[PDB]
Amino acid sequence: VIHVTKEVKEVATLSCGHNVSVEELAQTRIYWQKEKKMVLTMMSGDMNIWPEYKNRTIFDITNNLSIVILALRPSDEGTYECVVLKYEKDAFKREHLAEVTLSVKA
């Protein structure tokens, strides 16, 4: 679902669209970003959420590496991209890229 539209204050769900077994998360880095403003990082099990989204961000690995933002705000409208990288021998290889756009009606 490239385009998702939710009303203000509702629950926003964005699916990275890729399923990764819990076994390989150590050899995987997952980045959710929004127009080159980092949102969430899962570097080899070490997580990190930026201040703009630390309070209202839930990351679900099982559900297609999806994220949930509660209490949608008018300034959160934009395009979000999910990138998954696998640690191959002496390199980090991008194994999936997904782009999703969220619009807020007010």
Partner 1 sequence: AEYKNTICPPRQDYRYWYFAAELTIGVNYDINSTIMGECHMSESYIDRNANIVLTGYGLEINMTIMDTDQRFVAAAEGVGKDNKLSVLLFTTQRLDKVHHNISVTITCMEMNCGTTKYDSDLPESIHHKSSCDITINGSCVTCVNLETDPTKINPHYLHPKDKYLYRNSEYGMRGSYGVTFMDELNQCFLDIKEVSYDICYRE
Q: Point out which residues bind partner 1 (CB under 8 A).
A: 2, 29, 31, 36, 41, 83, 85, 88, 90-99
- The answer to whether 39 and 53 have CB atoms below 8 angstroms apart is yes
Smallest separation, CB 5 to partner 1 (Å): 18
Smallest separation, CB 99 to partner 1 (Å): 8
- The answer to whether 13 and 66 have CB atoms below 8 angstroms apart is yes
Smallest separation, CB 106 to partner 1 (Å): 26
Whichever of 13 and 79 has its CB closer to partner 1, that residue is 79
3: left (phi over 0), alpha (psi -120 to 50) or beta: beta
DSSP state of 12: E
Q: In whole angstroms, what is the distance from residue 24 CA to residue 38 CA?
A: 23
Smallest separation, CB 93 to partner 1 (Å): 5
